[PDB]
Amino acid sequence: RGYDDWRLSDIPQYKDGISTYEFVRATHEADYRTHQAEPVAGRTFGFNGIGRLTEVALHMPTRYTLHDQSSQYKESPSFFQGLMGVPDRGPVDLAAFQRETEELATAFENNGIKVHWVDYPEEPANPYGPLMGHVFLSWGSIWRGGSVISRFGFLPGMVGVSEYLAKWAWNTLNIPPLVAITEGAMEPGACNMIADEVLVTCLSASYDQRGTDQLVAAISKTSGTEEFHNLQLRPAVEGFFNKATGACAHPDININAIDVGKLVVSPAALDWDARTWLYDNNFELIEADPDEQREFLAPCNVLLLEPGKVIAHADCHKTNQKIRDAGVEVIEVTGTEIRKACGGIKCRVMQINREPGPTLADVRNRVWR
Amino acid sequence: RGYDDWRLSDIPQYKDGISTYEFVRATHEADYRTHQAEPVAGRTFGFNGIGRLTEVALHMPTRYTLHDQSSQYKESPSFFQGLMGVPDRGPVDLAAFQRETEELATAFENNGIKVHWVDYPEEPANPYGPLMGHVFLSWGSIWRGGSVISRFGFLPGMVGVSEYLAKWAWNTLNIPPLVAITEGAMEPGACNMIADEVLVTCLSASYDQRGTDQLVAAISKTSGTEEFHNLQLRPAVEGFFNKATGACAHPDININAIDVGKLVVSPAALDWDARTWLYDNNFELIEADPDEQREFLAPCNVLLLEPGKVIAHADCHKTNQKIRDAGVEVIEVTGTEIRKACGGIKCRVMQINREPGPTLADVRNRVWR
Amino acid sequence: VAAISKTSGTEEFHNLQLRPAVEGFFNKATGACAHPDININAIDVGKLVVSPAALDWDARTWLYDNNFELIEADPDE
Ligand code: NA
Ligand code: NA
Ligand code: NA
């Protein structure tokens, strides 16, 4: 459209004969997401909900991506093994890690999902040491309304990284920032949603109440939904993972939607209040295999491509058969090397755009019991 | 520092023998501004307070910087004159506008202040028309903790512009975003501070309570101060300016600090509650000349370089003499072309860095009455 | 708690409430239990034996702030 072709009618709040007060008031009442954020970006964005995923980002590992090669890790493996708490399966193999990355990218491409690639500098470091955990791009997933700078609860190696990803999103995709978390802890990208307006968080090493309150207040305003619900799990774990039980600080390892009103869920996830809430709101629970969970094969860490279709770890044979039995298509992808650190396949995916999908009302209205 | 020289002692929360729980808790308790925002940026930043200004940005006008060249302005001058409410002083002259810009830059250089330059594209437009008001870079001033995306209450021509300035600050200076305002109206860069922890806002066309609450909550957490105060003026004005009275929607036209516990203030600014608050907190008021105020010569729009030294419009002879009588040095700078739109000299300056300066306690402790 | 607090013989009364992830009495996948007596117990003044499956973050914080020392039970046992 030509620079000299613009007219007052191109301003949505403008009307012939409108008073100053009325124009201003209409401006104050406009919706931020649809009036400002999306039009200025030139596109929709946000991974909220359980609708159709269209766009993601991955990181192709280099030798600097490997947590066990940080000089700080070398100084004290046991310090980082306490923070992470995941089973020791030996050193990360770079070549195999690269191969499973290619396989994940192909799964997306075979299903019509756009894949962007995020690179980091050589010898990447923040003020406190080498980057660590920066393969886990879910930590930079984009909300309706914009990107978030996180406060990491347990991993100093991620300082600077949510900044880098948000900046990448702005420069590469024109997606703006929504908020920085500035108190307590909050790692929103490791949260997930089980309906269009239902967020699952934890209280854990990765989330306190103050951080949660700040994040939820910001994303609720741009959620595109009338109401917003936060189901808060209360896992018994000290760091990231509890290898005695399968309990995890991140929702993405405890629970995930596989279809409308159907969740895959860890044995270690549901305290009584959470169970009651899910029951009352008509969610059907597919229980993950207990050994798969406890051994950190990440059977709940499935990525929903759309209701009824997920990407899952190829070696979660028992959980994946239960998911298929629930009428859901499973795309199996190798995820052996990724699980040597604090996450699985879903955890490594930055979700950029998901189309609007089924609501909590749709969950409540499904007749299945 | 070498990539392989990092040790655990480089992590501030680390200590020999610390448990996982204790390390995580120390991480949750760390201060965002000094642990994350500033170290990742590689520098301090923020214009908060009344200390020494060190760094600003200006825009050198082009033909597209002129509001009277927008096709929307041409379609209805009276619409925009209703929104703005400022006296008509005739057409902007590009070349003279450029000249007064160079004069302001020289004043900054003569006073030891670093000046960055912001350019816009040719034929710059947002989703709703040509940019308008984009010379006024105060709207992009940087807070302790980071940049802000604003919700403009009356000027659709600024949609997209606070985004552009924040992105510029991130790419050019490595300064991160703090928050996007997503409800109501809030134009924080046209606010000003009268002590290290005292923010002056208005309730007006440019600010509602919801927008104010969002902004104040965000900047208070990174203010670097134990307490934070918001003095809210209640000007009687419909749009930007009330040409019958001198009242303005923006604090920056109503009031400004000139020294520790000394303010220049418009006759039209102080409702009884605001006057009482200023009295109880020991602020001395220098009243701007009423004719200079009403004629929009912007006599309260002075830029504090440090306590006791301001830049002011060269033609505010009466107010400037009152400021000098109060023991403050005035640097007079031409600001004729800038005032044809909704702002004065201070309004066109993006403040990037101001050193920590006197506190509300310092104001309260000054003995002068 | 209202009933026993009035006859406790003590000026104050505190209830630490654990939130175990278990559907019935016992969770054989995790070691979590519906009963406190299987999750935690005092062994001396300010020293507790405690299950890996017992302590949510709020409970852990409360115990830490009140100076209780935790001996972790063997996870397989
Ligand atoms: Na719960
Ligand atoms: Na000032
Ligand atoms: Na508890």
Author numbering:
A (entry chain A), B (entry chain B): 11 to 379
C (entry chain C): 226 to 302
Task: Give the published text.
Mycobacterium sp. JS330 produces 2-nitroimidazole nitrohydrolase (NnhA) that circumvents 2NI activation, conferring 2NI resistance by hydrolysing it to nitrite and imidazol-2-one (IM2O) instead. The initial characterization of NnhA indicated that, unlike most other known enzymes that degrade nitroaromatic compounds, NnhA is a hydrolase that functions without catalytic metal ions, molecular oxygen, or other cofactors. Despite low sequence similarity and limited occurrence in a few soil-dwelling mycobacteria and Actinomycetota, NnhA maintains the α/β propeller fold characteristic of GME superfamily enzymes and forms an unusual hexameric ring structure formed by a trimer of domain-swapped dimers. The residues in the active site of NnhA appear somewhat conserved in comparison to the ADI and DDAH, with the catalytic histidine, glutamic acid, and cysteine residues present in NnhA as H260, E197, and C357.
Using this process, we identified a variant of NnhA containing three amino acid substitutions (T2I, G14D, and K73R) that exhibited a substantial increase in soluble protein production in E. coli compared to the WT when analyzed on an SDS-PAGE gel. We isolated and purified this variant protein (referred to as “soluble NnhA”) with a yield of 8 mg of protein per liter of E. coli culture and compared its catalytic activity with the WT protein. With data close to 2 Å resolution (2.04 and 2.16 Å), the quality of the electron density maps was good and showed unambiguous density from residue R11 to R379 at the C-terminus. In the unit cell of the P1 space group obtained for soluble NnhA, three homodimers are arranged to create a hexameric ring, with a large pore in the middle. There are three dimers found in the hexameric structure, and therefore each protomer has interactions with three other protomers, including its dimerization partner. NnhA also has an N-terminal extension that makes extensive interactions with the adjoining protomer to form a domain-swapped homodimer, the presence of which also distorts the first β-sheet in the proceeding ββαβ motif. The third T2I mutation is not resolved in the structure as it is located at the start of the polypeptide near the N-terminal His-tag. Both G14D and K73R introduce oppositely charged residues that are located such that they could potentially introduce a salt-bridge interaction to strengthen the dimer interface. However, the minimum distance observed between them in all the crystal structures was 6.2 Å, which is further than the expected 2–4 Å for a salt bridge but may still be relevant when the protein is in solution and in a dynamic state. The conformational flexibility within the oligomerized complex was also supported by the crystal structure, where high B-factors were observed in surface residues of some protomers but not others.
